Ligand binder design. Structure first.
Ligand SMILES: [Mg+2]
Ligand SMILES: [Mg+2]
Lengths: 134, 192, 683, 144, 134
DNA sequence: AGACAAAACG
RNA sequence: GAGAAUGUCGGGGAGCCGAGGUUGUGAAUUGCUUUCAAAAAUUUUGAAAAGCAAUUCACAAUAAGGAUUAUUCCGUUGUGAAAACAUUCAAGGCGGGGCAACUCGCCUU
DNA sequence: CGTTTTGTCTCGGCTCCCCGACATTCTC
């Protein structure tokens, strides 16, 4: 009834256990097989290897695990850059966030889950950001 | 005549003949070996290269550059032996199955490997043809032996094998044989 | 010399050498020994060392001498004669060795006495053993050796039985010690697994107090078919089974448009399943399912030792002595009492909710090790030793193709649809060549000659293409070829239009075309596009081989159109087909499994192209197979259907969802805890 | 129930034995190639396509050379013409026909080599032909 | 005759004019319409926005221009992660470089142009790295 | 003989 | 119940060899179809080429493939994620056997 | 597209290890 996507922060909060409630919430999202964008996967890999210094082998294995059983990667859309330029005029965010939103919308995603994106804001009348942890 | 000329003449007579799979399927290797030996011996009388010891040594080194023992052994032969015996008609012998023989249930050995462990090697069983096993079996049968009388079925023994001399006599008699039976054993004690 | 030199030339050389070293004339010696019959291959229980040790004790008289007894055995002899105390000497010894007062009594000792004296054990006393947890069982399984039993079948059955027992132990008792109070076994040639399994499993249900001693623990209670069947009949489990299997028999009735597959009975006032006599060759109501095994297990588990004793030794010699067991176990001798009040209800409810777990063999590639002889250079010396093969060398664990090899042909006079090719192979000319078949020969002159010959023979291939007919045809090939000559005909290349792939790519292997080997269509990919429509494919074994070699998944995750891969199916995989009204998109909740849900579980059987055949998981053997003559079967011509057997008859692949079950038949579905653990293991 | 090679292991062993026999035949052929090349018996066109440096005695990749058929500018020609003519003379004497496959000359040479000189390339052809067919033999022997 | 791919460093050296010779060389490569991997594009965007602080609008416009006229983006291959795990055992590089090589090879790229990848090294007998600036 | 894989038949 | 010995009947595994068949290369001979390409009365005869073969012979491959130059090999078996294993596996010494390589025993850790 | 029908590598020799079932004698 509504295609749902996620950002890196959701999977990070899942991976982090300092915050039991937020980790629980993020894992609760993942029980719904939410969609996701490949750029989210790449950014997750980078953050894993930089902040947490985890091994390349372990990070790759977990990426494969999650992409195989829990979540669903979204095929990169060739119209991502043109649309992102279209979104930039009306929207002033980080180009990375703009790219994520561009790909999510181009895949008909109806809800995007993230914190640092001015929650509740509607992007081009096609996708409303939802902040779940509140 | 050799198999080759037999095939040749069968082919002369009936040019439609099927050779492979019809005329000669399988025959003793002796036919092929004899034909090849005859051919090689006859041709050795004509081609000098078959008499060049330098070429024979060159071929031996080519095949056995790393096996000096086999090189030396072949150096006493000629091209004929090399062609038939070593190259074309060399059949390998069966692999040894002695490694799969069972192990003794009584005797072990213990040794320490490079891993600082102490593990057990097993002793292989004895081939029953071994004289030691034969003696063991013969003694066992001697001890288990005991006679009975037909009439009243009483344990008549202890009257014919009662002193060590009787048992020595029985063992001496048994050694000389390869098999024993009712009549021989009964006749031994003079019994019938 | 005779035993070790088993070679003609070697044997004669050894003979001659022996005759030279010992001053024996080598004239009649080799003649005598050149034809010595080789010794038969057979070995004793003990080695030479043990026999040498035991002989001195066994010998007597002049052949007997004290000094021929090794140091330890002489010490033991001294101890025994002395009557002193040693921890290596048992009381049974002095009981047996009361007569061995003096050293000279140690003569002519039988095998048992000498064995004990030399080694100190009264023959094999066994160890009995006792497992304290599942760790012992899993170690036993790990160290099991292949080919250790009669045949592969019993070995596979026994090993799977042990694995299932371990799984049950872990699940229901945490592997805690002495969790299983008692274990019963039944088999129903197969006798072999009767005793070995009991002996192995005695280690779990044993008692260490000394009461339980023997080959098998007293808690192991093998049964017999008599007890099982009599319990089943008295307990009405036969009624439950009949009720369970009945719907298949009404379905067969509908299919046949008759009523001979179900028979009314008035004593019970219900239909009982039945088969017509013509379809009663080897029919058995029990073997047509997989759940009767579990039913038999349940029957066995409640049969106490009293039941087996009573029904194996019912002969009493007196009514009174066995009357107690009769009263304790039989209602008043008419029927046995149920284990408890609701046994029939519990058995029905459990049997109706049993998912059959199927073992799968999906091996494609597996690493292999190669050691070969080679001259290695060490310490300035060349020495022969075994070097390992470098690089990654896989071993293909399936037959890559069928044996028959066909050549590729292009016949202008036949239409080839795009994506298909013509391949021709040689075949013998025989009576099986009719006009239809005669139309499949690549050569046209052969077709002409064969048609003419067959027509001359009244169009009867049996007469035309018999060996005599073929001989006559070869004799007179002129008369059937317009009088033009022709070589004799013995084999002809018949062509077939299909999809055959090359064997290889090097040399002439590109000229060899073959078909997929039996049971190699192991993968069946299902993709779904953004819209929702499903796409199906069958991955060739070869593509799977490259994909697995590259470290990739067996099935591509996306097809040419870009449709995402929903999942791949393999034989014996279990799928759930939701009801027509059901909308299973994010269902999960695979714990509330009732008879209705389990009734919609199917098992993949075979695959080809976009076709995937299924059979309901609880079906073992069809009531009737398919025959080309009568043209009827429980599941039509293939003995399996692409659709459900229920009246809806819906395409299974269109709405099926894969499921995962363990050895004990419990479904596995992602949960909060599961997801948490997925990257908790990495944390 | 009755027993008929009902074992996957037995089938695997059967395939392995077949492969082993094939490999040993190939090894024998390669050793023959090396020895004959050193002896300088192989025809030049044939020897040119056989590796003697890295993959000893083996044919060069993507090649199917024939000892007796020489390929010149896409045309294959028989190598032993005079032997073929001798065989045709013998056939004419037998009074059968004068049109026979060239490869039948192998048997004529085999007969001729017994008491006549033959060209060395012909001897190499004969030796490889012998390698092809070895015959039946039992390891133990033990003449009955 | 040989499919050719590029890494971020080539386009960076093109964008940088401090080094006339290297910029020239990189521009010379671009005259051949070399293939490229989307991850190269994303990493280029990041480096542009971080080191050079260029505007989002200008960076997006240049990305679109280059992808339209000069180079050819390579569609992301869904087998990138599994292959990368396969490559990691035999190869010890940065997971980003491993991902780039994985995608390049999965697209049949025959030559990869880059500096910081141990030039001349062959990756799984399918793609030889070429260092062009030498 | 058995049951898969695919041609062949509607 | 366990052990030792002697026979009968089966089962399992491994090893040294043999003969075909199939596909493909080349050749000898004879065909069918098409097209060229002539002669002749839409039809008949002839040369050439191509497709498909037949009978016979020499040769190549025979699970795709990967090692190696030892007279060596691994590739359809089982376990299960470690793509890791099982199915070769120590040291010495005292002898038997051989044209010697290599093979068969004994003894102590 | 849905269903049924069809075709699927085959034969020879010999040796050497192991296990088990059933019998017989003997011992514990
Ligand atoms: Mg971000
Ligand atoms: Mg980089």
């Amino acid at each position: 009834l509504d295609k749902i996507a996620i950002d890196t922060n959701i999977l990070l909060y899942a991976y982090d256990n300092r915050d039991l409630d937020k980790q629980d919430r993020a894992v609760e999202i993942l029980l719904k097989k939410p969609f996701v964008t490949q750029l989210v996967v790449f950014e997750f890999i980078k953050v894993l290897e930089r902040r947490f210094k985890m091994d390349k082998k372990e990070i790759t294995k977990l990426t494969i695990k999650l992409l195989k059983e829990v979540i669903i990667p979204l095929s990169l859309h060739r119209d991502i850059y043109n649309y992102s330029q279209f979104l930039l005029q009306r929207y002033n965010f980080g180009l990375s966030d703009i790219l994520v939103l561009s790909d999510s919308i181009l895949n008909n995603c109806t809800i995007l889950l993230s914190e640092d994106m001015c929650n509740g804001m509607i992007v081009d009348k096609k996708l409303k950001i939802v902040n779940p942890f509140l | 005549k050799t198999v080759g000329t037999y095939i040749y003449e069968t082919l002369l007579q009936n040019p439609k003949q099927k050779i492979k799979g019809k005329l000669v399927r399988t025959i003793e290797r002796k036919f092929y070996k004899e034909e090849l030996r005859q051919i090689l011996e006859k041709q050795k009388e004509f081609h000098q290269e078959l008499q060049s010891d330098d070429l024979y040594n060159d071929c031996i080194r080519e095949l056995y550059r790393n096996n000096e023992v086999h090189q030396l052994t072949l150096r006493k032969k000629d091209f004929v032996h090399l062609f038939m015996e070593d190259i074309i008609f060399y059949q390998r012998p069966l692999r040894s199955q002695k490694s799969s023989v069972s192990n003794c249930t009584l005797e072990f050995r213990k040794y320490k490997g490079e891993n600082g462990a102490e593990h057990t090697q097993y002793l292989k069983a004895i081939p029953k043809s071994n004289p030691y096993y034969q003696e063991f079996r013969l003694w066992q049968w001697i001890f288990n032996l005991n006679l009975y009388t037909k009439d009243n079925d009483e344990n008549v023994t202890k009257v014919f094998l009662n002193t060590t001399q009787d048992f020595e006599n029985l063992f001496e008699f048994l050694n000389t044989r390869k098999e024993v039976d009712q009549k021989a054993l009964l006749k031994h004690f003079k019994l019938n | 010399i005779i035993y070790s030199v088993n070679d003609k030339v070697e044997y004669e050389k050894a003979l001659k050498s022996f005759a030279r070293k010992h001053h024996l004339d080598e004239s009649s010696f080799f003649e005598a020994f050149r034809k010595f019959p080789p010794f038969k291959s057979e070995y004793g229980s003990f080695s030479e060392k043990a026999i040498k040790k035991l002989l001195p004790l066994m010998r007597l008289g002049k052949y007997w001498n004290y000094a021929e007894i090794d140091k330890y055995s002489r010490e033991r002899i001294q101890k025994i004669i002395t009557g002193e105390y040693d921890e290596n000497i048992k009381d049974k010894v002095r009981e047996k060795s009361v007569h061995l007062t003096i050293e000279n009594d140690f003569q002519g000792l039988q095998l048992w006495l000498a064995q004990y004296i030399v080694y100190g054990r009264h023959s094999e006393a066994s160890m009995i053993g006792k497992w304290n947890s599942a760790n012992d069982l899993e170690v036993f399984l790990k160290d099991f050796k292949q080919h250790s039993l009669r045949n592969p079948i019993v070995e596979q059955v026994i090993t799977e039985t042990l694995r299932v027992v371990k799984d049950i132990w872990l699940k229901y008792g945490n592997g805690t010690k002495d969790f299983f109070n008692e274990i019963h076994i039944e088999l129903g040639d197969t006798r072999y697994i009767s005793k070995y399994i009991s002996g192995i499993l005695s280690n779990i249900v044993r008692v260490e107090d000394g009461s339980d001693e023997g080959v098998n623990s007293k808690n192991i209670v093998p049964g017999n078919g008599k007890i099982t069947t009599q319990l089943k009949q008295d307990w009405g489990l036969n009624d439950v089974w009949n009720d369970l299997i009945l719907p298949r028999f009404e379905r067969m009735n509908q299919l046949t448009n008759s009523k001979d597959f179900t028979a009314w009975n008035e004593n019970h006032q219900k239909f009982l399943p039945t088969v017509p006599i013509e379809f009663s060759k080897g029919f058995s109501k029990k073997r047509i399912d997989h759940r009767h095994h579990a039913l038999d297990a349940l029957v066995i588990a409640c049969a106490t030792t009293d039941h087996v004793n009573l029904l194996n030794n019912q002969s009493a010699k007196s009514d009174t002595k066995r009357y107690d067991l009769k009263k304790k176990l039989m209602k008043f001798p008419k029927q046995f009492l149920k284990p408890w009040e609701k046994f029939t209800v519990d058995a029905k409810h459990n049997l109706e909710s049993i998912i059959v777990s199927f073992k799968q063999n999906l091996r494609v590639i597996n690493k292999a090790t190669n050691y070969y002889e080679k001259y290695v250079e060490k310490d300035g010396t060349k020495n022969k030793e075994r070097v390992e093969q470098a690089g990654t060398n896989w071993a293909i664990r399936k037959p890559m193709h069928k044996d028959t090899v066909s050549g590729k042909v292009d016949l202008p006079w036949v239409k080839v649809p795009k994506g298909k090719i013509l391949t021709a192979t040689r075949k013998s000319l025989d009576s099986s060549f009719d006009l239809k078949s005669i139309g499949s020969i690549t050569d046209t002159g052969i077709q002409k000659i064969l048609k003419n010959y067959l027509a001359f023979k009244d169009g009867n291939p049996e007469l035309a293409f018999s060996p005599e007919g073929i001989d006559d045809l070869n004799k007179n090939i002129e008369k059937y070829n317009d009088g033009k000559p022709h070589q004799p005909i013995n084999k002809v290349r018949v062509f077939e239009l299909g999809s055959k792939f090359q064997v290889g790519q090097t040399g002439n292997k590109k000229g060899k075309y073959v078909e997929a080997a039996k049971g190699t269509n192991l993968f069946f990919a299902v993709y779904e596009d953004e819209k929702g429509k499903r796409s199906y494919e069958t991955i060739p074994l070869n593509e799977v081989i490259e994909r697995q070699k590259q470290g990739l998944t067996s099935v591509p995750l996306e097809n040419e159109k870009g449709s995402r891969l929903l999942f791949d199916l393999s034989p014996n995989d279990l799928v759930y087909v939701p009801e027509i009204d059901e909308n299973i998109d994010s269902n999960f909740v695979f714990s509330n499994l009732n008879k209705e849900k389990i009734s919609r579980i199917y098992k993949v059987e075979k695959t080809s192209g976009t076709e995937c055949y299924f059979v309901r998981q609880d079906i073992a053997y069809l009531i009737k197979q398919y025959d080309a003559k009568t043209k009827i079967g429980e599941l039509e011509s293939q003995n399996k259907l692409q659709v459900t057997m229920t009246d809806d008859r819906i395409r299974i692949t269109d709405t099926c969802v894969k499921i995962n079950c363990d050895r004990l038949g419990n479904i596995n579905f992602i949960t909060k805890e599961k997801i948490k653990q997925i990257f908790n293991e990495f944390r | 129930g009755k027993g008929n090679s009902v074992s996957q292991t037995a089938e695997r062993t059967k395939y392995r034995s077949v492969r082993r026999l094939r490999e040993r035949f190939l090894l024998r052929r390669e050793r023959l190639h090396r020895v004959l090349y050193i002896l300088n018996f192989l025809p030049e066109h044939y020897a040119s396509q056989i590796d003697f440096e890295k993959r000893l005695g083996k044919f060069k990749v993507e090649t199917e050379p024939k000892l007796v058929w020489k390929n010149t500018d896409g045309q294959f020609s028989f190598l032993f013409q005079n032997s073929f003519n001798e065989m045709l003379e013998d056939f004419k004497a037998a009074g059968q026909e004068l049109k026979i496959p060239y490869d039948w000359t192998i048997y004529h040479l085999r007969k001729k080599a017994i008491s006549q000189k033959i060209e060395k390339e012909e001897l190499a052809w004969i030796l490889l032909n012998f390698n092809h067919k070895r015959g039946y033999y039992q390891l133990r022997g033990e003449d009955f």
